[PDB]
Structure formats: structure tokens, C-alpha cells
Amino acid sequence: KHELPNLPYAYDALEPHFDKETMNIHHTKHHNTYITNLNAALEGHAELADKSVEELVANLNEVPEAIRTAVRNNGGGHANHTFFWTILSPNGGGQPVGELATAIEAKFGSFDAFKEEFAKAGATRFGSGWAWLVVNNGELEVTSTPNQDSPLTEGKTPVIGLDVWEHAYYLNYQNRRPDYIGAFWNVVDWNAAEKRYQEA
């Protein structure tokens, strides 16, 4: 009973920053496959299967050992991509807004300095993974995670994030990960980010 969410915008709405071919394959093949595999691993655990994917992944510890890796990886994939689609927008880009903006200035010095730290976290994540701005204390932290591991599992709440698996950027940027991260700034939705900051 885990379903693929529709995108909040057209498949070409993030162009030229994120290409429509990637949006299609990333959403309808990669994300869908995580869902397929999650639902299979949850066959026989109908009790577990009625949690939200976010709660499921936050309390990975309580998943039966037999299916834990499958939940970590595929539950991770579902939680992470679900989040991702909703922090992007064709009306995104620009400066941070709201109390999140003020908090970024305080924690990082400035928005430019934050962007730098986030881009370094993204560039430095060796292999597959994600770069994040999270709330831990009630404090902002830049982090990165391997594969489909989620900050939620560490008790940290995602405010924004960027998929740095090669499938996310290879068609448009090839090995140019930094150019991809640069493009993300033009589509990240700071209104949505504010909500996530406030809602945590």
C-alpha cells in the first residue's frame, strides 16, 4: 500500500536545470522500483506496512532483521525521493525566505557561505548518496548520507536535500557534479523549505 506520488509539476518544468528525460526516468523507473521493492519486503508484515514511510525509516531499529536491509534501502529510496520532488519548483530559486533565512545567516554567516558548505558536502560524498540541510538540535546542520540512508534515522529533520547518485545528473552533466549542484539552486523551493523548517 505504498504508492508513487505524482510530481507537483510537469516533467519539463525544471528545465534547463534538471532535464525532462531524467525527471521521467528518475520518477517513473527509479522511485517506482524502490516502491515495488519496499512493498515486496513488507509482504507478511501487514502491521509494519501501515506505517508512513518516514516513521518506518526513522525507527529502522524495530524492523525485523530479516527484512531490515531491504527497508533501509528501499524505504530510504521512497522517503528520500518523495521529499525531493516537493523541495523543487519551477517557481523556486533565489534567496532563502522567512525564519529559515534568518537562521541560515546566523548559523552559516551568509547564504553564499551556506551554499558553499552544502556544495562541498555534495562534492565530497564519495559514491552514491545525498546532501542535506537538516535540523538537529533545533540547530541547522549541513550533512551528507550514503546510498539511501535518511537523516530521519539519526533523529535529524530534512529541510532541503539533493540527490547525488549519478542517475540524478549523468544525462545532463556527466561527471560534472559541481555544475549540477550549481543548477539545483535555481530550482530549490525556499517557500517549501521554510514550511519544513517551521514544521519541525
Q: Does 117 bind a second copy (CB under 8 A)?
A: no
- Fill in the per-residue mask, 28 to 47: x = in contact with a second copy (CB under 8 A), - = not in contact: -xx--x--------------
168: Cα within 13 Å, side-chain hemisphere: 26
Q: Does 178 bind a second copy (CB under 8 A)?
A: no
Q: By CB under 8 A, name the one of 8, 146, 179, 198 that touches a second copy.
A: 146
Strands of the sheet with 129-135, listed across from one edge: 140-146, 129-135, 157-163
Rounded to the nearest 10 degrees, the angle between the axes of helix 98-108 and helix 111-124 is 80
59 versus 174: smaller Cβ distance to a second copy? 174
Among the listed ranges 1-9, 124-132, 152-160, 184-192, the one in contact with a second copy (CB under 8 A) is 124-132
Could you tell me if residue 154 is left (phi over 0), alpha (psi between -120 and 50 degrees) or otherwise beta? alpha
19 versus 163: smaller Cβ distance to Mn ion? 163
142: Cα within 13 Å, side-chain hemisphere: 19
Considering only residues 105 to 134 of the shown chain, the ones binding Mn ion according to CB under 5 A are none
Q: Does 60 bind a second copy (CB under 8 A)?
A: no
CB of 139 to a second copy, least distance (A): 27
Q: Does 65 bind a second copy (CB under 8 A)?
A: no
Q: How many residues bind Mn ion (CB under 5 A)?
A: 3
**Cβ(169)–Cβ(119) below 8 Å:** no
163 labeled binding residue: yes
Q: Does 147 bind a second copy (CB under 8 A)?
A: yes
Q: Does 163 bind Mn ion (CB under 5 A)?
A: yes
Q: How many residues bind a second copy (CB under 8 A)?
A: 19
Residues flagged as binding site for Mn(2+): 26, 81, 163, 167
**What residues make contact with Mn ion under the rule CB under 5 A?**
163, 165, 168
What residue ranges bind a second copy (CB under 8 A)?
A: 25, 29-30, 33, 73, 126-129, 146-148, 165-167, 170-171, 174-175
